[PDB]
């Protein structure tokens, strides 16, 4: 088709690692169905791991 982009090397969106800095400020300064999408998703599965290192929360 018209855009032929003969050069793919990259994605949309990456996040390995972020700081809870600019994750609260990218939040209330940036704004994209991306990002937001992005940053929760961060959040929460951040956060996920979190309780499940101090505690698995398992009992027999």
């Given at each position: 088709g018209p855009l032929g982009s003969p050069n793919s090397g990259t994605?949309?969106?990456?996040?390995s690692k972020w700081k809870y800095a600019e994750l609260r400020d990218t939040i209330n300064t940036s704004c994209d169905i991306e990002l937001l999408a992005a940053c929760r998703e961060e959040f929460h599965r951040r956060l996920k791991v979190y309780h499940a290192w101090k505690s698995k929360n398992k009992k027999r």
């Open positions: 994605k949309k969106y990456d996040l």
